Amino acid sequence: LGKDHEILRRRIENGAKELWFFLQSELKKLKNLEGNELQRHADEFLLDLGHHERSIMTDLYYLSQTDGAGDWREKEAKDLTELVQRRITYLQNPKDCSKAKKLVCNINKGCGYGCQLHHVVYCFMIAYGTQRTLILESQNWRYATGGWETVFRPVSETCTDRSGISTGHWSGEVKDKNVQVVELPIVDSLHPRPPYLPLAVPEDLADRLVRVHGDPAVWWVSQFVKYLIRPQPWLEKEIEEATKKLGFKHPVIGVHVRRAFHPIEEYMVHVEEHFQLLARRMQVDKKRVYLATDDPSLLKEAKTKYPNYEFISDNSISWSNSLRGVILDIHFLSQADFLVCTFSSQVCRVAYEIMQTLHPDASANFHSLDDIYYFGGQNAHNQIAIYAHQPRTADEIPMEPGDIIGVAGNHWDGYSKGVNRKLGRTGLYPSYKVREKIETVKYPTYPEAE
Amino acid sequence: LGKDHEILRRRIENGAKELWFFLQSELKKLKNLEGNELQRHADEFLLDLGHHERSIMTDLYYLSQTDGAGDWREKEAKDLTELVQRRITYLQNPKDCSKAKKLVCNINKGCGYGCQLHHVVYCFMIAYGTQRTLILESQNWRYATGGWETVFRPVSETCTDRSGISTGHWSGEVKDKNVQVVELPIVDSLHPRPPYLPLAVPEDLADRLVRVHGDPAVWWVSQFVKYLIRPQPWLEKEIEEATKKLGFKHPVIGVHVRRTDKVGTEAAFHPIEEYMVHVEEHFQLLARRMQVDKKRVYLATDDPSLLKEAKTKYPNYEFISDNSISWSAGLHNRYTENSLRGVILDIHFLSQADFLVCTFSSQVCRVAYEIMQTLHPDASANFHSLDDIYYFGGQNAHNQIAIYAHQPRTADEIPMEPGDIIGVAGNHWDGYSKGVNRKLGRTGLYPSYKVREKIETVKYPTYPEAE
Ligand SMILES: Nc1nc2c(ncn2[C@@H]2O[C@H](COP(=O)(O)OP(=O)(O)O)[C@@H](O)[C@H]2O)c(=O)[nH]1
């Protein structure tokens, strides 16, 4: 079993049991207070609970590493990504470009960099699913006159032209089985939708992925992000020089403030709380925050309000134009130990996706002030109720074990919101009473890549 | 790495994180309420928290069993107990009793059955530690004139006579090395004390025991209880027949309500409701993972009127109890073979239950809890005590080690730094324990989660010839 594994499991269990003893006793006392005394005691109660809750979280972290688990998870995550990158690379580099099935993707969607990048990711996932080589059209790119390849590696070494014996607009994989070159539109108008879309995961990888990673959907998205953003040597060098110039070092928490309005304190409470967690398992000499924002006055405000934090930020005037800022910001957010921001932002999502490629399982190393993780155009995100729920208020929905719940969001207060598809009712339910429903799709497995 | 293990670990982690989201949000709302509305919301809050906390505990239970862990823990616990029983049996059965080193123990300490049995255990552990065959003197035992063997097997198949070429009172292992027969008195005045006492565990078993079991000290005590209470054939048949006549079936929770002479002197009176709160909560835990058709309680008590009171107050529970045994425990009748049979049976069924609610100040409940350790791989946490933590009368000081610093909020609390040795007096079951910080010489309250147990070890003989 492992002595440390057993010691830690029992200490998590006893720690939670002592938490419950404490909760019952203190809540019973809180019932008899009022006014200011009630607030004093409730606030002390909260402070005590936080440290206690973090000791449980710290033991759970140690449990995840103990008795070789950390090393095994790292090796397996490495094997999985090398497997997928090998398949993508095999698909992308046919020997005869003239006879390859192709899918043509135009990068120049009318939106920002993160949205354009996710459009290429969506093209790539469908190309992978249909066994078509992705051809990326990037001329007249707003972010770089020379196009994609002046900044990132070409998505193929052997096949970058869209020539073929037959060309057509996407009409479905079977309908298109004999069209060599298929042009794919933006996801918003895609008809018919193939199954090769988030949040599903390939069947042949699903079992291994669940063993390794807490959100396989994001891991799967991130393999395509990883391949796409292979940087040219000069950009790799620029990122290296910025790291030294900015003093970007660990531990560091990334904060992306996109401008509902959220005040800086709403981000920073989660920053501080995560640094308290980290201090239980490592020495934190300086609390470093990488701040990405489109508000030029926010940086000054953060430094003044949090003088014990070192705020690192990118105020690049030139390279050593907006493309420079977004690349550096996404890079440093993705490299942080924890990410605080609103997943409604594509930039925040991109950083979180890239972060998955830097650790065996970074799925939980974020806090979003609004949305849960999603991919624009994804199929319905469903959960499965595991425990019954009886609504206490009219804003809550009932659940029985097995009910399919279409989740709209997590309110980060103990409750989530969604629709109970068995009942046709929408409302609030306790977040702990459902589990994620991992969707799978039969993808090609490209055995020839091995 | 096993898939279920990973799924469960993550759900425990996410379950706790959601618990913390819920705590912060709901406490913020409670701060703005007062009076009756505050009391209603607090009570709903408590109800919601209980189900949520039990989901976390249920996932932790599954984690302990998953991916072969349950099978492995069961086999290793079985290998450990077979090893120790084999060593004890080897010690207890020398080839020539007339040439064997012996330790003589008299069962008739001036106290009740559990205290007397624990005296024999203390004798036995010292005999095992000193490589002396235990000789149990039990004639004129207050519970049975005919002695231990009227109910239990003799503690040896080959060596029950106390004779030898030399006999002496205990004076220590080195001094007594050439005394064939050593007489051991009660623990209260033993000098010099040997190290073979609770709560320490043998060095040679400590690592394996920490791997399998949440309280090795009790497991070690329980091996000697297990050997001692091997039943005579007639008692074995009686226990089997009582099991069938009582309808004793699982799941069942054992409740020992000790009253009579215990109250005031060594413990307090506790009303039935204080026991049943913990019974009800544990059945709520069990219903998470199994079907509970009937909520069964095995009630052992020295109060004969309690059974009817309990049935009336808890009409949806099935109370399994022998009310003639409760009467047999009355003070005037207590030291009789009738009463002995009753307390052996009550302790047996308590020990067989899936969970135990009692007052550990009573030796009866501690015996049941010790026996329970021999029936499961790790039953160390399957109790709730209304007063004391587990202890063994005569043990060496029970110490803990602070793992997280504590800064006192009230005058009743003690400070702690990591590494401080804390002498625990008790757990108040409210988040705080009480003890002395030995570094500071200060006594008071500290958060129970901020210490770990200090497992003590002693070099014992290993009887390699027993293999
Ligand atoms: N059968 C039975 N006898 C009991 C019960 N409670 C107390 N007694 C009797 O009272 C004695 C109490 O002495 P002891 O075992 O040393 O435990 P303590 O006095 O409770 O710490 C027991 O040994 C029994 O003889 C009970 O629940 N059932």
PDB file of C-alpha atoms in Angstrom, chain A residues 1-3 5-7 9-13 15-28 30-35 38-39 42-57 59-61 63-64 69 72-73 207 209-214 273 280 361 364 367 386-387 392 410 412-415 431-432 435, chain B residues 1-3 5-7 9-13 15-28 30-35 38-39 42-57 59-61 63-64 69 72-73 207 209-214 281 288 378 381 384 403-404 409 427 429-432 448-449 452:
ATOM      1  CA  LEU A   1       0.000   0.000   0.000  1.00  0.00           C
ATOM      2  CA  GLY A   2       2.565   2.529   1.229  1.00  0.00           C
ATOM      3  CA  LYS A   3       2.970   3.626   4.838  1.00  0.00           C
ATOM      4  CA  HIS A   5      -0.200   6.743   1.736  1.00  0.00           C
ATOM      5  CA  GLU A   6      -2.010   5.098   4.639  1.00  0.00           C
ATOM      6  CA  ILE A   7      -0.891   7.697   7.209  1.00  0.00           C
ATOM      7  CA  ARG A   9      -5.412   8.862   4.079  1.00  0.00           C
ATOM      8  CA  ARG A  10      -6.183   8.473   7.793  1.00  0.00           C
ATOM      9  CA  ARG A  11      -5.124  12.036   8.539  1.00  0.00           C
ATOM     10  CA  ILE A  12      -7.358  13.418   5.790  1.00  0.00           C
ATOM     11  CA  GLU A  13     -10.234  11.423   7.250  1.00  0.00           C
ATOM     12  CA  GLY A  15      -8.895  15.980   9.811  1.00  0.00           C
ATOM     13  CA  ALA A  16     -12.316  16.112   8.153  1.00  0.00           C
ATOM     14  CA  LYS A  17     -13.888  14.442  11.202  1.00  0.00           C
ATOM     15  CA  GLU A  18     -12.311  17.037  13.510  1.00  0.00           C
ATOM     16  CA  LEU A  19     -13.529  19.751  11.128  1.00  0.00           C
ATOM     17  CA  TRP A  20     -17.049  18.409  11.571  1.00  0.00           C
ATOM     18  CA  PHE A  21     -16.718  18.304  15.368  1.00  0.00           C
ATOM     19  CA  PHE A  22     -15.589  21.946  15.237  1.00  0.00           C
ATOM     20  CA  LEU A  23     -18.392  23.069  12.893  1.00  0.00           C
ATOM     21  CA  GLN A  24     -21.171  21.589  15.031  1.00  0.00           C
ATOM     22  CA  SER A  25     -19.827  23.036  18.266  1.00  0.00           C
ATOM     23  CA  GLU A  26     -19.123  26.542  16.962  1.00  0.00           C
ATOM     24  CA  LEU A  27     -22.371  26.841  14.992  1.00  0.00           C
ATOM     25  CA  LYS A  28     -24.298  25.895  18.123  1.00  0.00           C
ATOM     26  CA  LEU A  30     -23.125  31.175  17.049  1.00  0.00           C
ATOM     27  CA  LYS A  31     -26.872  30.550  17.351  1.00  0.00           C
ATOM     28  CA  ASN A  32     -26.910  32.331  20.727  1.00  0.00           C
ATOM     29  CA  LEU A  33     -25.126  35.525  19.649  1.00  0.00           C
ATOM     30  CA  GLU A  34     -26.332  38.710  18.001  1.00  0.00           C
ATOM     31  CA  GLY A  35     -25.060  41.965  16.575  1.00  0.00           C
ATOM     32  CA  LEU A  38     -21.972  37.522  16.477  1.00  0.00           C
ATOM     33  CA  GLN A  39     -19.874  39.109  13.755  1.00  0.00           C
ATOM     34  CA  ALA A  42     -18.246  34.394  12.994  1.00  0.00           C
ATOM     35  CA  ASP A  43     -15.143  36.108  11.597  1.00  0.00           C
ATOM     36  CA  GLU A  44     -12.824  34.287  14.039  1.00  0.00           C
ATOM     37  CA  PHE A  45     -14.666  31.065  13.131  1.00  0.00           C
ATOM     38  CA  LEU A  46     -13.958  31.703   9.435  1.00  0.00           C
ATOM     39  CA  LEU A  47     -10.270  32.348  10.080  1.00  0.00           C
ATOM     40  CA  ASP A  48      -9.967  29.100  12.069  1.00  0.00           C
ATOM     41  CA  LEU A  49     -11.843  27.147   9.385  1.00  0.00           C
ATOM     42  CA  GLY A  50      -9.586  28.409   6.591  1.00  0.00           C
ATOM     43  CA  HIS A  51      -6.354  27.163   8.155  1.00  0.00           C
ATOM     44  CA  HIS A  52      -8.048  23.897   9.074  1.00  0.00           C
ATOM     45  CA  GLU A  53      -9.442  23.435   5.562  1.00  0.00           C
ATOM     46  CA  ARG A  54      -5.990  24.131   4.072  1.00  0.00           C
ATOM     47  CA  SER A  55      -4.364  21.461   6.266  1.00  0.00           C
ATOM     48  CA  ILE A  56      -6.798  18.947   4.721  1.00  0.00           C
ATOM     49  CA  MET A  57      -6.009  20.267   1.227  1.00  0.00           C
ATOM     50  CA  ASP A  59      -2.570  16.420   3.057  1.00  0.00           C
ATOM     51  CA  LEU A  60      -4.587  15.657  -0.102  1.00  0.00           C
ATOM     52  CA  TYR A  61      -1.811  17.231  -2.175  1.00  0.00           C
ATOM     53  CA  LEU A  63      -1.439  12.046  -0.906  1.00  0.00           C
ATOM     54  CA  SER A  64      -1.422  12.726  -4.668  1.00  0.00           C
ATOM     55  CA  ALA A  69       2.320   8.512  -7.491  1.00  0.00           C
ATOM     56  CA  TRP A  72       4.090   7.783 -12.276  1.00  0.00           C
ATOM     57  CA  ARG A  73       1.586  10.526 -13.108  1.00  0.00           C
ATOM     58  CA  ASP A 207      -9.387   5.448 -19.684  1.00  0.00           C
ATOM     59  CA  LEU A 209      -6.753  10.252 -19.364  1.00  0.00           C
ATOM     60  CA  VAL A 210      -9.136   9.786 -16.435  1.00  0.00           C
ATOM     61  CA  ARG A 211      -6.322   8.045 -14.585  1.00  0.00           C
ATOM     62  CA  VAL A 212      -4.026  11.064 -15.047  1.00  0.00           C
ATOM     63  CA  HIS A 213      -6.033  14.236 -15.320  1.00  0.00           C
ATOM     64  CA  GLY A 214      -8.976  15.887 -13.567  1.00  0.00           C
ATOM     65  CA  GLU A 273      -5.794  32.233  -0.163  1.00  0.00           C
ATOM     66  CA  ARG A 280       1.905  25.035   4.051  1.00  0.00           C
ATOM     67  CA  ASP A 361      -2.566  17.539 -13.995  1.00  0.00           C
ATOM     68  CA  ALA A 364      -7.626  22.534 -10.712  1.00  0.00           C
ATOM     69  CA  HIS A 367     -10.185  30.124  -9.924  1.00  0.00           C
ATOM     70  CA  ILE A 386     -25.026  11.300  -7.664  1.00  0.00           C
ATOM     71  CA  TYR A 387     -27.032  12.280  -4.544  1.00  0.00           C
ATOM     72  CA  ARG A 392     -35.429  24.186  -0.022  1.00  0.00           C
ATOM     73  CA  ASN A 410     -20.870  27.045 -10.788  1.00  0.00           C
ATOM     74  CA  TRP A 412     -18.571  29.172  -6.309  1.00  0.00           C
ATOM     75  CA  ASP A 413     -20.783  29.355  -3.194  1.00  0.00           C
ATOM     76  CA  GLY A 414     -21.661  25.686  -2.875  1.00  0.00           C
ATOM     77  CA  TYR A 415     -24.336  25.847  -5.607  1.00  0.00           C
ATOM     78  CA  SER A 431     -22.346  21.404  -6.524  1.00  0.00           C
ATOM     79  CA  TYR A 432     -21.086  18.382  -4.586  1.00  0.00           C
ATOM     80  CA  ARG A 435     -20.237  14.238 -11.034  1.00  0.00           C
TER      81      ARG A 435
ATOM     82  CA  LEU B   1      -2.089   4.181 -10.471  1.00  0.00           C
ATOM     83  CA  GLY B   2      -5.676   2.919 -10.287  1.00  0.00           C
ATOM     84  CA  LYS B   3      -8.417   4.837 -12.080  1.00  0.00           C
ATOM     85  CA  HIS B   5      -8.284   5.616  -6.693  1.00  0.00           C
ATOM     86  CA  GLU B   6      -7.590   8.744  -8.776  1.00  0.00           C
ATOM     87  CA  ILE B   7     -11.289   9.531  -9.337  1.00  0.00           C
ATOM     88  CA  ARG B   9      -8.976  11.229  -4.507  1.00  0.00           C
ATOM     89  CA  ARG B  10     -10.055  14.065  -6.805  1.00  0.00           C
ATOM     90  CA  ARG B  11     -13.649  13.902  -5.639  1.00  0.00           C
ATOM     91  CA  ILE B  12     -12.573  14.014  -2.006  1.00  0.00           C
ATOM     92  CA  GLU B  13     -10.513  17.081  -2.872  1.00  0.00           C
ATOM     93  CA  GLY B  15     -15.819  17.744  -2.245  1.00  0.00           C
ATOM     94  CA  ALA B  16     -13.792  19.511   0.444  1.00  0.00           C
ATOM     95  CA  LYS B  17     -13.270  22.542  -1.797  1.00  0.00           C
ATOM     96  CA  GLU B  18     -17.007  22.810  -2.404  1.00  0.00           C
ATOM     97  CA  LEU B  19     -17.555  22.420   1.361  1.00  0.00           C
ATOM     98  CA  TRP B  20     -15.279  25.432   1.860  1.00  0.00           C
ATOM     99  CA  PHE B  21     -17.136  27.442  -0.812  1.00  0.00           C
ATOM    100  CA  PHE B  22     -20.390  26.595   0.977  1.00  0.00           C
ATOM    101  CA  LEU B  23     -19.043  27.422   4.454  1.00  0.00           C
ATOM    102  CA  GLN B  24     -17.785  30.856   3.413  1.00  0.00           C
ATOM    103  CA  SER B  25     -20.964  31.820   1.575  1.00  0.00           C
ATOM    104  CA  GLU B  26     -23.426  30.618   4.229  1.00  0.00           C
ATOM    105  CA  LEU B  27     -21.504  32.040   7.219  1.00  0.00           C
ATOM    106  CA  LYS B  28     -21.494  35.404   5.458  1.00  0.00           C
ATOM    107  CA  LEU B  30     -25.635  34.085   8.954  1.00  0.00           C
ATOM    108  CA  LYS B  31     -23.734  37.165  10.156  1.00  0.00           C
ATOM    109  CA  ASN B  32     -26.672  39.336   9.027  1.00  0.00           C
ATOM    110  CA  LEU B  33     -29.426  37.387  10.817  1.00  0.00           C
ATOM    111  CA  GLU B  34     -30.673  37.434  14.389  1.00  0.00           C
ATOM    112  CA  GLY B  35     -33.060  35.683  16.711  1.00  0.00           C
ATOM    113  CA  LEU B  38     -30.738  33.054  12.657  1.00  0.00           C
ATOM    114  CA  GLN B  39     -31.555  29.868  14.567  1.00  0.00           C
ATOM    115  CA  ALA B  42     -28.152  27.844  11.374  1.00  0.00           C
ATOM    116  CA  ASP B  43     -30.064  24.569  11.817  1.00  0.00           C
ATOM    117  CA  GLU B  44     -30.658  24.067   8.079  1.00  0.00           C
ATOM    118  CA  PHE B  45     -26.989  24.971   7.533  1.00  0.00           C
ATOM    119  CA  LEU B  46     -26.013  22.245  10.022  1.00  0.00           C
ATOM    120  CA  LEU B  47     -28.281  19.704   8.299  1.00  0.00           C
ATOM    121  CA  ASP B  48     -26.847  20.496   4.827  1.00  0.00           C
ATOM    122  CA  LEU B  49     -23.276  20.311   6.207  1.00  0.00           C
ATOM    123  CA  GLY B  50     -23.879  16.869   7.741  1.00  0.00           C
ATOM    124  CA  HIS B  51     -24.888  15.249   4.449  1.00  0.00           C
ATOM    125  CA  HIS B  52     -22.007  16.984   2.684  1.00  0.00           C
ATOM    126  CA  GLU B  53     -19.487  15.892   5.337  1.00  0.00           C
ATOM    127  CA  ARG B  54     -20.793  12.312   5.098  1.00  0.00           C
ATOM    128  CA  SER B  55     -20.295  12.321   1.330  1.00  0.00           C
ATOM    129  CA  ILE B  56     -16.624  13.168   1.916  1.00  0.00           C
ATOM    130  CA  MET B  57     -16.359  10.431   4.559  1.00  0.00           C
ATOM    131  CA  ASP B  59     -15.562   8.699  -0.620  1.00  0.00           C
ATOM    132  CA  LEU B  60     -12.724   8.292   1.893  1.00  0.00           C
ATOM    133  CA  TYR B  61     -14.146   4.886   2.879  1.00  0.00           C
ATOM    134  CA  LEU B  63     -10.691   5.130  -1.226  1.00  0.00           C
ATOM    135  CA  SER B  64      -9.484   2.848   1.583  1.00  0.00           C
ATOM    136  CA  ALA B  69      -6.348  -1.895  -0.922  1.00  0.00           C
ATOM    137  CA  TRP B  72      -4.271  -6.204   0.851  1.00  0.00           C
ATOM    138  CA  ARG B  73      -5.124  -4.669   4.235  1.00  0.00           C
ATOM    139  CA  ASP B 207       6.178  -0.317  10.602  1.00  0.00           C
ATOM    140  CA  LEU B 209       1.253  -1.986  12.141  1.00  0.00           C
ATOM    141  CA  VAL B 210       1.348   1.694  11.118  1.00  0.00           C
ATOM    142  CA  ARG B 211       0.725   0.576   7.538  1.00  0.00           C
ATOM    143  CA  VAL B 212      -2.422  -1.399   8.425  1.00  0.00           C
ATOM    144  CA  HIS B 213      -3.958   0.190  11.466  1.00  0.00           C
ATOM    145  CA  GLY B 214      -4.979   3.577  12.755  1.00  0.00           C
ATOM    146  CA  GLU B 281     -25.494   9.828  12.597  1.00  0.00           C
ATOM    147  CA  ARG B 288     -24.655   6.064   1.976  1.00  0.00           C
ATOM    148  CA  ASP B 378      -8.592  -1.608  10.976  1.00  0.00           C
ATOM    149  CA  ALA B 381     -12.050   4.592  14.260  1.00  0.00           C
ATOM    150  CA  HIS B 384     -17.687   7.324  19.515  1.00  0.00           C
ATOM    151  CA  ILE B 403       2.402  19.546  13.715  1.00  0.00           C
ATOM    152  CA  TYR B 404       0.987  23.090  13.275  1.00  0.00           C
ATOM    153  CA  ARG B 409      -7.206  32.947  21.426  1.00  0.00           C
ATOM    154  CA  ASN B 427     -10.489  15.063  23.340  1.00  0.00           C
ATOM    155  CA  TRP B 429     -15.108  16.159  20.597  1.00  0.00           C
ATOM    156  CA  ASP B 430     -15.736  19.819  19.709  1.00  0.00           C
ATOM    157  CA  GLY B 431     -12.556  20.520  17.736  1.00  0.00           C
ATOM    158  CA  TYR B 432     -10.406  20.953  20.851  1.00  0.00           C
ATOM    159  CA  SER B 448      -7.279  18.599  17.847  1.00  0.00           C
ATOM    160  CA  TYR B 449      -6.273  18.760  14.192  1.00  0.00           C
ATOM    161  CA  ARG B 452      -0.360  13.852  15.516  1.00  0.00           C
TER     162      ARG B 452
END
